[PDB]
Every structure is written in C-alpha cells, then in structure tokens.
C-alpha cells in the first residue's frame, strides 16, 4: 500500500539551522580581574589559529 | 431439486406451492454466496500512481498495474 511523505518538520529545522549558522559564536578568553591586559592575546592567537 | 421442482411442475400442469418457490429462491442465492465473496477482489493500483517514498525497495517505479 502507498506511503507518501509530506513532512513539514524539515522547513522548521532548516529555518533553525539557518539561524544558528548566521550567528557563529566562538571563544574569547578575557584576561582576569588581576592579570595584565595583554594576557589573552597569546592564547587567543593560538586558538584562532588551529 | 427445489428449483427443479418449479421448472418441471408446468409439465404436469402445476403451479409450484409458495413454500417451494421461496425455498428455491433462497437456495439459489446460497449456492452463489461463497462464490460471490470469492469474486469480490480489489483491482491493483493504476497504470500511473506514484511509487511512494515510504515504500522501500523501488522494484517497479510508480505502481506495477500488472505485476
């Protein structure tokens, strides 16, 4: 017997993905309440790199 | 033999009694009953008719209409 596939879930999923795919979001590494301002850049540069 | 009775009764100048014609009418239906049920049968899907994504193993695309 026939079995059609007329879903409506996909479009929702597609939409949701498309939204998260346009708001990348990555790491930051802020220094710290005590540390010197130029603390992060070293690590961050490394992270960004690989 | 009830239906037989009705058919040959005119040979002997005779109208078959009611109960007989009734039983003949009744009997003749019953003969065909089990046959009628056998002869029901739904025809297959048409020449066209999509195959259906839900149905796995494509075989003949759309519907066979002949198989």
UniProtKB/Swiss-Prot annotation, chain A:
It comes from the Viruses. Forms the portal vertex of the capsid. This portal plays critical roles in head assembly, genome packaging, neck/tail attachment, and genome ejection. Procapsid assembly may initiate with a nucleation complex composed of portal and scaffolding proteins. The portal protein multimerizes as a single ring-shaped homododecamer arranged around a central channel. Switches upon genome packaging from an asymmetrical conformation in the procapsid (PC-portal) to a symmetrical ring in the mature capsid (MV-portal). This change of conformation may serve as a signal for headful packaging. The chain holds residues 52 to 101 of 725 of the full protein. Homododecamer. Interacts with the terminase large subunit; this interaction allows the packaging of viral DNA. Interacts (via C-terminus) with the head-to-tail adapter protein gp4; this interaction participates in the head completion. Interacts with the scaffolding protein; this interaction initiates procapsid assembly, thereby ensuring incorporation of only one portal ring per capsid. Interacts with the capsid protein. It is found in: Virion. This is Portal protein. The gene is 1. Belongs to the p22likevirus portal protein family.
Curated annotation (Swiss-Prot), chain B:
Monomer; homododecamer upon binding to the portal ring. Interacts (via C-terminus) with the portal protein; this interaction participates in the head completion. Interacts with the Tail hub protein gp10. Interacts with the tail needle protein gp26. It is found in: Virion. Tail protein that binds the portal ring and functions as a head completion protein. 12 copies of gp4 form a structural ring at the bottom of the portal ring. Together with gp10 and gp26, gp4 is required for stabilization of the condensed DNA within the capsid; perhaps by plugging the hole through which the DNA enters. Plays a role in ejection of the bacteriophage DNA into the host cell at the initiation of infection. Functions as an exolysin that catalyzes the cleavage of the glycosidic bonds between N-acetylmuramic acid and N-acetylglucosamine residues in peptidoglycans. The N-terminus changes its conformation when transitioning from the preassembly state to the postassembly state. This is Head-to-tail adapter protein gp4. The chain holds residues 84 to 150 of 166 of the full protein.
């Amino acid at each position: 017997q026939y079995r059609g596939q007329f879903d409506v879930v996909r479009p929702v999923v597609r939409k949701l993905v498309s939204e998260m795919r346009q708001n990348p979001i990555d790491v930051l590494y802020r220094p710290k309440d005590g540390a010197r301002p130029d603390a992060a850049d070293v690590l961050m540069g490394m992270y960004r790199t690989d | 033999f009830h239906n037989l009775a009705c058919r040959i009764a005119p040979d002997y100048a005779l109208e078959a009694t009611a109960k007989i014609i009734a039983t003949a009418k009744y009997g003749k239906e019953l003969l065909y009953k089990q046959t009628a049920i056998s002869r029901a049968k739904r025809a297959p899907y048409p020449s066209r008719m999509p195959t259906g994504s839900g149905n796995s193993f494509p075989n003949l695309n759309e519907w066979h209409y002949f198989p």
